Structures are given as C-alpha cells and as structure tokens.
C-alpha cells in the first residue's frame, strides 16, 4: 500500500464533501479536509507501516501540536499520515473549489 493510494482516497472524498455542501470558499474547507483524512487513513498495522515506507511522506511533523505525547508508536505514525494528508489537501483547495464552480455553464 502506498502513500499515493491514501492520498488519492482523501482527495476524492474531499471532492465529494465539496459537492454535498456546495462549498465555495477556502475559509469554509477546514472540516471537509479533516474528515477526508479520517476516511482515508489506513486502519491495519501493516498498511500503516507500508504507507510510511513509501514515497511522499517523511517521519517529522510540521506542527508538533498535531503530535500526540504517547508511548504508542502506531498512533504517532497514524497522526503523521493524518497531518500530511491535511497539508496536501490544503495545497489543492483552491484548484478543487475552481473545478467545482466551473463544472456547469449556461
């Protein structure tokens, strides 16, 4: 399993969530982006480890506030996937909101 597989899952979910709520502005995207990650983060042990082994994600956190102070290693890794997803989805926010707005014309 690869990081691109998980990322292609949250990216598609966010597209869906955008349509369902007619979202038009980045300032109203926060919750859709964070739910998207929740739905795409892997749940199995090996899948989480396989994702950490693949292209597109490093072990360091960008904001240490999103890192849990815990002895549970697997939660720390899951939290890092979750964080990278949210960062990468935010870089596509404007593009996605433009594609939605532009999909109809009279």
């Amino acid at each position: 399993m690869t990081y691109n597989n998980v990322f292609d899952h949250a990216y598609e979910m966010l597209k869906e969530n955008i349509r369902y709520d007619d979202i038009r502005d980045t300032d109203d995207l926060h919750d859709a982006i964070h739910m998207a990650a929740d739905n795409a983060v892997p749940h199995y042990y090996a899948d989480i480890f396989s994702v950490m082994a693949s292209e597109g994600i490093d072990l360091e956190f960008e904001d240490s506030g999103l890192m849990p102070d815990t002895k549970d290693v697997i939660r720390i890794l899951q939290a890092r996937i979750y964080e990278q997803l949210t960062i990468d989805l935010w870089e596509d926010a404007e593009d996605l909101l433009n594609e939605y707005l532009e999909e109809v014309e009279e």
Partner: protein, 464 residues
Amino acid sequence: MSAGKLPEGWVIAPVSTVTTLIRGVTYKKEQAINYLKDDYLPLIRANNIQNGKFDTTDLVFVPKNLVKESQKISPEDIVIAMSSGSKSVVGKSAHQHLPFECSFGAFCGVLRPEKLIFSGFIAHFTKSSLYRNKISSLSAGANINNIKPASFDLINIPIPPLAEQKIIAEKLDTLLAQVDSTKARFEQIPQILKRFRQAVLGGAVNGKLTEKWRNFEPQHSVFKKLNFESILTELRNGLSSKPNESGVGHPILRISSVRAGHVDQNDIRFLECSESELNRHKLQDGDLLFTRYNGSLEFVGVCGLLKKLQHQNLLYPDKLIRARLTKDALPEYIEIFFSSPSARNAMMNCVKTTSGQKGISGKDIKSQVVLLPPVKEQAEIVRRVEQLFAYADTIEKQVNNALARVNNLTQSILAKAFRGELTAQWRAENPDLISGENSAAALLEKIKAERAASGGKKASRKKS
C-alpha cells in the same frame, strides 16, 4: 596521580582484589516447561535493574531450572549489573533488598568482602559518570560490544578507609532521599490543586447554597451565559502569497503556540498592513485565548492568557477564538474555569462527536453556562490558584538545583572523602569550634595548617 588525583591515605585497588566473587549468570532452556512451571524463586531480566531499585521481578524462575543452569542464588543487599544494553558499554546497577534472587547471563552478581568494601559505596561509585568514562576507554570494540566481566575486574577504584566509606555513603544516601522527598510533595501538590479546582469553583467560599440550573451553587452567586458577560470574536488568516504581510514585528498566535503555554510572543508574526487590510482583530492584554481547531481530544477546549506590558499586544489566526469581558470579571478566574474538566464534560455531553468536530462553534461558546461571583471573591479565588501554580514551579526549580548540588558535592567528596583527613575529625577541644558557621571553617583551616606543618617533618607523610 592515577585514575584521578588521589589522596595519601588511599590506594587504588582493582575491584577484583577488593571483591570476593565476580561471575556471570546464564540462560535456562526456555523450551522446557518444568523450569518455569510453578516457580518460587524470582527470575530477573535486564529490564529489572533498569526499572527502579530491585524490589520486583518480571519473570519467575524455578529451582529445578536453577539446578540445571549456571544461574546461582545471589545474596541480599547485593549489587547487580547488566552487561547488555547501554551506550555501547555503560552497565546498569541495582541493589536487591528482597530475599536471595537469581538472574540471567546479562546480569552480573557482585559481592563485596566484609568490611573490605561496602555495597552502598560501590553502587554510587559505579553510578558515577567517571565510572562511565573509564569503561568507554575500552571502546565499542569488535564483537564484544558489552562490558566483559574480565574487563570489569581490571577496573581501578580508589579505596577509602572503612569508616569513611560509611560516612561518605550515608551523606549521598540522605541527598537521594531528599530528592525523593521533594518529589513526593511535588506529586501531591497537583493532586491537591486538582481538588481545589473542583471545590473552589463550584463551592466557592460561602456556606449557604441553593439548587441551580448548573449544579448546586452558592446562594449569593448568580447565573448567566457567556454571551451575556463576554463578547465572542471570530478570526481569519492572512494570505500566505503576499510577502507584505510576512514582514512583521507584531505577534500572531496559532494553536501551536497555545500548545506551548502562556503566550507573550508567537513564532510567526503578522504585519500592521496585514491587520488593516485583512481587518484582523487585535487583542489587548489580559484577554482570554481559546482554541478553535484541531479540536483537542476531539470536541474539548484549550485555553491561554495573553501577556503584555504596555509594550506589546497579540493577534491570532482563525484557529483560535477570543473573548473580551464587558466588565466585572477576572480573566484569570475564567481561564481556569474553562480548562477545568467539568467544562470538558458538559461540552462533550451537549455535543458529541459530530460532523462539526475538533472545533467549537461560536454559538456553543456563547451559550456556555457560567457562574458569576462577586468581583472580590473572584480575585481571591484566582490569586490562590495562581499562587499554587507558582509554588509547583518553585519546587521544580528547587529540585533542579539540589540535583546540581549533588553533582558538585560528589566531585569534591570523592576526592576529599578519599583523603584520610576525612576519617579524622578536626582537632578541637570543644565542639563549639565547629558549631559556629564561620568558626567551624576557621577551625578547619587551623587544623589543616598545623597538620601540614607536622607533616613537613617527614616527606613520607605527604609523599605516601
């Protein structure tokens, strides 16, 4: 001169000479059930020494197992070392109060000869960093990245007089106890603080109470909602693209900073041009700060209080939410109230994890339930709470210095305890000489000079 500057009285003897027996232990056949089955005699692994003093045993090892194995029964009040596991070659140490116990290959039981060397003395001695350096001299080594028992025996350690070893050891022991003592008080204080939190807020200082919408509360107190007392402000972030916003000198505090704690300053700052164009909300000092995003443990709240002298003020991002008091209120009191766990529960009950989650809506905050004490009472409660927090901080600092003190003292005493002078008391007809703080020092000086002079008679006195 030797391993280190060493005094006249002492000799540097190898541990082997000073130690009655130095030997390793071995590993039992794990496969056989009989060895483990129904075991009376505790079996210890490397982890055991590392975790605390050795009172407890993780694994259990039967005497049948003992018979068929190199493992032997160690005596009580014995020092133990762990061969494997370390920064390539330190070694861990421990003392075993509990009845004679056994261990595996990594552990090395060591017995000091009676009156030759004390267990207590050795334990601290090994603990010393100087000890670590000595071993490191060997290096990582090849194929043997551990401390070879043979190498261990070679070790040169100074030997004090028997009497002094006890005195020296006792002093160190007391210090260790002291740190433990402070730690105990330290743990207790937040427990106590926690209790005040619940009791003070709800109970308040009164005595007459009545039923209330929000739990039992004082009769004098009155009930209101957050919106009534305070005003909620929402906030937006500047566009990253424009660098004009980027040059700064004015603080912008994100949730991350909130995680840090009390906030005078922030990692990233936003420019005045940004504030005007963006129309960001500026915050005056003494204001309340709250966390709007990343939830926390899901729907829950986080708080902080902004600090400023008339020099500075703070502005924040969307992620954070601000509250401004209309008037009669004490910000510190409210802040503690929010962080209280009672608040956490109420918020959670009202709203469970839902689509809107990992965040607090403005409506939720405004509708929030709160007590309104009198101004004076609020100040009193706040002062008490804040003071307690300060106390916890001070104790921590005290502990730190004490730890440092031990390090300094250990360095001196290792050398000095090592001098014969330490066994002997300072020459004084009256104990009063020592009693005075200054007087004791003076007496010491006089004794030293006189002793040296007498020493002058023979070179051997100094020389030996």
